[PDB]
């Protein structure tokens, strides 16, 4: 287990780390998109709380994203899927901040657990979609793969899309969007990327995640212990030992960090307008 | 931004509390 570094404590330390470090891993969760208008999973107004209400027939809200339940009955998921399908939201200040870090070559990687694709919209390139996305779908039985456009219609009509290859009378021959469900493997990209990154990372920043789900939650314990770790989150994570704890809205906290950093980071915050010559 | 969005509450040695922190709820 990783113990906290005693020589890294203050927000001033955090800023200096951000100035000097050149191989930063940023690990993000649903928190970074709530300001965009996308609720998280585990908060009072989150996805799981809403599921407990709108789908009370489930053993528990997690069953909606559980592979063993999905195989038993995929109808709930496809009634609900269109609600979490990537809409037309704009990236938050935090996405833009990560994009700038990448643009400046300081971002080793952004591991995101989100499926809202806001990282792409923000122009972050060195990203890993730890928990997949709606970009493709795959038959549960034969593994036939299709693009999202092939099943999009069925999703927005709340019907279970069928495999076109498998027998037309095969009940489990359905096209599951390649989002990672409980009991499923994460994409191979994740594992390869982590093997490359763990001995390279010189700073870890966790933003807007409860880190309650493995293997993503294992990242902080799987990198070298001396690597500094910063948390930016509404709630502390008692099961881990971060060096600096910045608690509150990530956009508020990132905004403050951007101003201390100056340069292009300060310019990222265009509202309100800063003093400048016309 | 929010009320006093630039100010934080410091719990030494390394915890900073900003607007939006869950500790303000209940
Ligand atoms: N504006 C915000 N700023 C900072 N932190 C925030 C904000 N809004 C929410 N948070 C915090 O972000 C965290 C989000 O926790 P989760 O809801 O559990 O989301 P996440 O960590 O990304 O979920 C992990 C995984 O669980 C699975 O169900 C699902 O596959 C998901 O990807 C919480 O600790 C919450 O307090
Ligand atoms: Zn098939």
What determination technique applies here?
Answer: X-ray
Determine the distance in angstroms separating the CA of B17 from the nearest CA of chain A, rounded to an integer.
5
Q: Quote the tokens at residue A189.
A: 């990209």
Sign for the pseudo-dihedral over CA of A37, A42, A47, A53: negative
Tell me how far apart the alpha carbons of residues B12 and A187 are, in angstroms, rounded to a whole number.
40
Tell me how far apart the alpha carbons of residues A186 and A178 are, in angstroms, rounded to a whole number.
10
In sequence order, the 6+-apart residues with CB closer than 8 A to the CB of B2 are A249, A252, B19, B20
Give residue A142 CA to ligand 2 midpoint distance, Å.
4
Is residue A60 lining ligand 1, measured as CB closer than 6 Å?
A: no
Q: Quote the tokens at residue A208.
A: 């807007």
Contact A202, A21 (CB under 8 A): yes
Contact A134, A168 (CB under 8 A): no
Specify whether A191 is catalytic: no
DSSP per residue over A83-120, as a string? Answer: GTS--SPPP-HHHHHHHHHHHTT-EEEEEE---S-HHH
Ordered strands of the A203-207 beta sheet? A127-129, A107-112, A24-28, A203-207, A229-233, A244-247, B15-17, B9-11
Q: Quote the tokens at residue A249.
A: 């809205």
Is residue A209 lining ligand 1, measured as CB closer than 6 Å?
A: yes
Which residues of chain A are within 8 Å of residue B20 when distances are taken between CB atoms? 234, 248-249, 252
Tell me how far apart the alpha carbons of residues A94 and A97 are, in angstroms, rounded to a whole number.
5
Residue from A116, A219, A234 to probe ligand 1 pocket by mutation (most atoms less than 8 Å from CB)? A234
Q: Domain containing B12: what range?
A: 1-26
Beta strand pairing call for A24-28 and A107-112: parallel
Q: Quote the tokens at residue B10.
A: 């410091």
Contact A89, A116 (CB under 8 A): yes
* End-to-end Cα distance, chain A: 54
Q: Quote the tokens at residue A11.
A: 């927000």
- CA distances from residue A119 to A65, A113, A129, A274 in whole angstroms, order as listed: 22, 11, 9, 26
Bridge partners for A233 per DSSP: A247
Give residue A31 CA to ligand 1 midpoint distance, Å.
5
Bridge partners for A129 per DSSP: A112
Burial class (CB in 10 A: 0-12, 13-18, 19+), A185: exposed
Quick one: resolution in A? 2.2
Tell me how far apart the alpha carbons of residues B22 and A44 are, in angstroms, rounded to a whole number.
11
Contact A157, A144 (CB under 8 A): no
**A165: which DSSP letter?**
S
- The single residue listed with the structure tokens 């990783």 is A2
In sequence order, the 6+-apart residues with CB closer than 8 A to the CB of A169 are none
- CA geometry: angle A99, A105, A107, nearest 5 deg: 60
Tell me how far apart the alpha carbons of residues A188 and A178 are, in angstroms, rounded to a whole number.
12
DSSP per residue over A189-255, as a string? Answer: HHHHHHHHHTTT-SEEEEES----STTGGGHHHHS-TTS-EEEEESS--TTS--SEEEES-HHHHHH
* End-to-end Cα distance, chain B: 23
What domains lie within chain A, and their CATH numbers? Answer: 1-34+92-130+188-278 (3.40.50.1220), 35-91+131-187 (3.30.1600.10)
Is residue A43 lining ligand 1, measured as CB closer than 6 Å?
A: yes
**A2: which DSSP letter?**
P
A249 touches chain B (CB under 8 A): yes
Give residue A149 CA to ligand 2 midpoint distance, Å.
17
Beta strand pairing call for A132-139 and A175-179: antiparallel
Bridge partners for A26 per DSSP: A110, A205
Contact A246, A230 (CB under 8 A): yes
3-class state of residue A124 by DSSP? coil
Ordered strands of the A175-179 beta sheet? A145-147, A132-139, A175-179
Q: Which of B12, B16, B24 to mutate to test the interface with A (most CBs of A within 10 A)?
A: B16
Q: Quote the tokens at residue A116.
A: 């809202």
Q: Quote the tokens at residue A183.
A: 């009991």
**A61: which DSSP letter?**
G
Torsion of CA A235, A236, A239, A241, to 10 degrees: 150
Chain centroid offset of residue B19 CA: 5
Contact A32, A95 (CB under 8 A): yes
Q: Of B17, B22, B24, B5, give the one whose Cα is nearest residue A11.
A: B17
A172 touches chain B (CB under 8 A): no
Within a 10 A sphere around the Cβ of A248, how many other Cβ atoms? 25
Tell me how far apart the alpha carbons of residues A229 and A4 are, in angstroms, rounded to a whole number.
8
Q: How many domains does chain B have?
A: 1
Is residue A116 lining ligand 1, measured as CB closer than 6 Å?
A: no
């Amino acid at each position: 287990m990783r113990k906290k570094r005693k020589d890294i404590n203050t927000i001033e330390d955090a800023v200096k780390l951000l100035q000097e470090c050149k191989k930063i891993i940023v690990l993000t969760g649903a928190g970074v998109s709530v300001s965009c208008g996308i609720p998280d999973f585990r908060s009072r107004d989150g996805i799981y709380a809403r599921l407990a209400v709108d789908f009370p027939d489930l053993p528990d809200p997690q069953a909606m994203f559980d592979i063993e339940y999905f195989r038993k009955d995929p109808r709930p998921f496809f009634k609900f899927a269109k609600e979490i399908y990537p809409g037309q939201f704009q990236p938050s200040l935090c996405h833009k901040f990560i994009a700038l870090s990448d643009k400046e070559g300081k971002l080793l990687r952004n591991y995101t657990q989100n499926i809202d694709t806001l990282e792409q919209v923000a122009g972050i390139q060195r990203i890993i979609q730890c928990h997949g996305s709606f970009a493709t779908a795959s038959c549960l039985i034969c593994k036939y793969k299709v693009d999202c456009e092939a099943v999009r219609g069925d999703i927005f009509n709340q019907v279970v899309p069928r495999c076109p290859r498998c027998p037309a009378d095969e009940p489990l021959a359905i096209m599951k969007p390649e989002i990672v469900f409980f009991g499923e493997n994460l994409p191979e990209q994740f594992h390869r990327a982590m093997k490359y990154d763990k001995d390279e990372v010189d700073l870890l920043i966790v933003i807007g995640s409860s880190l309650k789900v493995r293997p993503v939650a294992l990242i902080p314990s799987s990198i070298p212990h001396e690597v500094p770790q910063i948390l930016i989150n509404r709630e502390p994570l008692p099961h881990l030992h971060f060096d600096v704890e910045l608690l509150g809205d990530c956009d508020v906290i990132i905004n403050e960090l951007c101003h201390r950093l100056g340069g292009e980071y300060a310019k990222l915050c265009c509202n309100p307008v800063k003093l400048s010559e016309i | 931004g929010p009320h006093m969005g630039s100010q934080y509450l410091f719990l030494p040695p390394n915890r900073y509390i900003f607007h939006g922190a869950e500790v303000y709820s209940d």
